[PDB]
RNA sequence: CAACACGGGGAAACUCACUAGUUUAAGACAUUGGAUGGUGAUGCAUGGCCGUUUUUAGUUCGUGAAUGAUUUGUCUGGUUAAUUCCGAUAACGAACGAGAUCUUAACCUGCUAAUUAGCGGCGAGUACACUGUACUUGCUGCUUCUUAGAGGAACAUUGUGUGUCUAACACAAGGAAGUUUAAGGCAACAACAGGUCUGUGAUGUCCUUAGAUGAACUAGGCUGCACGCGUGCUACACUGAUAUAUAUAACGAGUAAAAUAUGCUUGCAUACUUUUCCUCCGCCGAAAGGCGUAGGUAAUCUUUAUCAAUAUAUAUCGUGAUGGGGAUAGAUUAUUGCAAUUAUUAAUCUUGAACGAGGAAUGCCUAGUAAGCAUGAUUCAUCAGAUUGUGCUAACUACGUC
């Protein structure tokens, strides 16, 4: 009965709800895909309906949440990202950060491009809320991946 | 208008490895750059070929 | 209670339950601020 | 079959694979009919609140429809199509006697 | 202010100028004489 | 036999069909004079006056005009007649004669041969115009 | 007043056991569940209480509760 | 004025071969002279459409409206009332508010269409959805078009 | 500036937080204590997002060199849209930004393709000529044009001038295109106690919680008005108004409530139909509008080889606060809605204010733009003078300077 336009929007909205629902569940593991444990989750969604940036950021907020020192945690994550073969990485931490005045702290390594469509093409980006004692910390992770090719580079054998 | 470091640097590299083939025609040079270079955009390949010709 | 099935108080955002700023074009039923958080995964990409 | 998608490249891959698949078996297809692209455009204010300059961004959801009419037994062409698709391509039945 | 009236180049302005007539009356004179703007006789 | 071609100025398109005939020229179902503004009428007669009356006397011409406004249609028609006459002589009559004819048209104007490609600059938020802005005040 | 029938409470518990899960939906002026023809306000009240006693856990996402039973809850609900 | 020198071959076989206005005025005048279609009396007190916001103020207009409608029917062979209402629409100054086009009055249109239909000029059918032109009218319009073309030309 | 048609904030109700008041429990847990919710307080507790700085051209490192903060690199000069290049040069080498990338729009593939697009082929008539032209029903090679996939095409190409004659510019030619083809999008570093807790179940603390700041219902009100400031709309007429006629546009956008029968008694309850979105079309209505029907979930029906207005042509005025001007008011019948009074909106007749081209001041703008003219979409039960798109009508003036 419904139109194609209506079909496409409903498909997108369903994806968005499911993505947020995955975010509410998935603190017990990394990222290992979706199926289109699994019995209860499948049952809920069926009942209702009828290098990886997210992983690194989720790991980082869990480490931060456990109250480990902020520099040590940031360095540990950053070094792990580089170890995993990153062409560049930047991790930003915003909020209170052990003071009664809010601040941000930047931790960058590697090429870490930002302008234009190569930025969208090669940089995966992730936001995560860490609620700590006096309110909330914002984790923003940016990872620039293994490359197709990066358009600026020109070389000859 | 001019030509950036990426363009000029590439232009210098070509000739460096392929002077003998390169010649005083733009279309032939463009053919050589297309064979030799790894550039992903038409406009950029042309720009390099133009400057190598120059 | 006395609801109406028409007019402003009849409807609210699918995600956040705000009554204001709702996109009803294409029957999305999401407020525009919420829509900005979701706008890539739904498919409503920016270009020009 | 009629192919509807929001991924151009995926539709293109499906188009080539069914085209090769059919042409083995000498099947009658009427060459890829590309329908006018429809874009769902949403014109969105930036900022969740008023302050600062009025700044808008224009979102576009571009949907691709493509069409092939085919004379054969349904089952093989649908089975070839259905296994060869990526789920982002939505497949709909169309069939002729000539 | 008007001071043109009923009784005594074929443009309406020329007739109005020469005989001191309102432009509808100038038009009326033109029509009588002959027997928006367009080609001339 | 028959050749078909076009003209395109702004969003107008005018298709010209140049067939073997007698010198009858129509615009949709309707004769060539029936296009209205007298000033722009002369522009569409203009290629006939540059080429004399003999060349059309062997050929019937049919025209289909769709889209665009008044000025745009007139230029598209003018352009389509140009493109039509020259293309017919390249397939059917003679390349040297066509080159001579093309030279006459080019010598007068290049606008007849190839349409002006000007088209709209998009509206951009912050003002009603394409570039124009809302009035700022302190 | 605001009574919830003994049979209705038992049916909600039974449904929760039978499935393992319940998608209640937050809104209370919607009158039925699609798979229980029960007042949603009543289902919400009992689930709120049940969570409070710690026999059922809710995940929660926008407008939807996603309730899964604790193992002690699964055993408890039978009687 | 009406005649001008021509640099191509005219056909003079149809309404599509002669300018709208001369054909329309003459046909309107002929129609009234013959007295085939009525005024009708109530029609003098009303406007053509709301974009006028005034009396029609031109006396012989009803015959003109019929004449134009008849021509539109040869031009476009299947149409209904809405097409006419849209055709004769023009701009309405809404006082302080901006202009909008506003549709022509549908009773006068409906009446003209009905009178023509009664006289065998135009025809309601299911094969082609609305009003089309029909055979006595088609012949008459074509012939009258020839009669005018010759009479005007030399 | 970077508040002030901004909070998509076009509020009849609800929306709503407010005013006059009235209710309600929807007070989990182990009476009682105990919270949960809060468009409550705090953006100088904060997250996120966004504005400015700035879409300009800036920013940073390794090593080197010159008590220290530091400086050099990153520069007298030439050049450029550009810390763009060249060149000089105690630095050499880098990196991000910028260009580049990407999306449209601009031109060519007689290749790639034909459906719900065209074009012909061909039957058949209606009309006119005259050894074809116009117009409709039925069947059915072509792909130029409609559409959209892939791919091509400009690099300052050639020629001529100017330039350390270096980077490069200037002119002419060629060319679909010569200001990186035109337009966008994307947005470094470091900020601002800029904006937002009235978008959020993002959120700290502080307040509040049955005579609630929760939930909820009825009115009233956000629009009131000696008066001050914004942005728009409509004007001040004759290159015009009025009235007929003719021509012709692009983007689009479209589907647990209604109605009939029965049981009780038009009220209530139950069944059945097929109901809410676009309206063609046929009838009725001055007009609004109505009734009857028909197709459309859409390149298929609304509707598009034509849906706008400025066009233009012919008439009517004839410069006179005038037939300019339509504020203001008075009387209507409609239409939406539970509710229209503070006139929702609609038409119809009547009513006929300021305003004679705008002081001091101050805004926007360089080519399909400016201006003028419309119109689609967004909100929408109903409401564009708003915003955002889109076209048509197509100027002026350079083409530079501090």
From TrEMBL, chain A:
Family annotation (Pfam families): KH_2, Ribosomal_S3_C
Domain of life assignment: Eukaryota
GO cellular component: a single term: nucleus
Protein keywords: Ribonucleoprotein, Ribosomal protein, RNA-binding
Signal peptide start-end: none
PROSITE patterns associated with the record: KH_TYPE_2 (PS50823)
Keyword Ribonucleoprotein: yes
Keyword Translocase on entry: no
An annotated GO BP: translation
Molecular-function annotations in GO: RNA binding; structural constituent of ribosome
Record family assignment: Belongs to the universal ribosomal protein uS3 family.
NCBIfam families assigned: PRK04191.1 (NF003219), uS3_euk_arch (TIGR01008)
Protein's name according to its UniProt entry: 40S ribosomal protein S3
Organism: Plasmodium falciparum (isolate 3D7)
Automatic annotation (TrEMBL), chain E:
Top-level division of the source organism's lineage: Eukaryota
Family in the record: Belongs to the eukaryotic ribosomal protein eS25 family.
Protein name according to UniProt: 40S ribosomal protein S25
Whole-protein coverage range: 35 to 102 of 105
From TrEMBL, chain F:
Keywords assigned: Ribonucleoprotein, Ribosomal protein
GO cellular component, one term: cytosolic small ribosomal subunit
Keyword Hydrolase: no
InterPro entries hit by this protein: Ribosomal_Su5_D2-typ_SF, Ribosomal_uS9, Ribosomal_uS9_CS, Ribsml_uS5_D2-typ_fold_subgr
A Gene Ontology BP annotation from the UniProt entry: translation
GO molecular function, one term: structural constituent of ribosome
Transmembrane segments: none
Keyword Ribonucleoprotein: yes
PROSITE patterns documented for this protein: RIBOSOMAL_S9
Gene3D superfamilies xrefs: 3.30.230.10
Family from the record: Belongs to the universal ribosomal protein uS9 family.
Protein name: 40S ribosomal protein S16, putative
Organism: Plasmodium falciparum (isolate 3D7)
Lineage: Eukaryota, Sar, Alveolata, Apicomplexa, Aconoidasida
From TrEMBL, chain G:
Cellular component GO terms held in the UniProt record: cytosolic small ribosomal subunit
Gene Ontology MF terms: RNA binding; structural constituent of ribosome
Cellular compartment(s): Cytoplasm
Keyword tags: Cytoplasm, Ribonucleoprotein, Ribosomal protein
Any one GO BP annotation for this protein: translation
Domain Plectin/eS10 N-terminal, residue spans: 4-79
Entry similarity comment: Belongs to the eukaryotic ribosomal protein eS10 family.
Protein's name according to its UniProt entry: 40S ribosomal protein S10, putative
Biological source species: Plasmodium falciparum (isolate 3D7)
Part of the intact protein present: 11 to 89 of 137
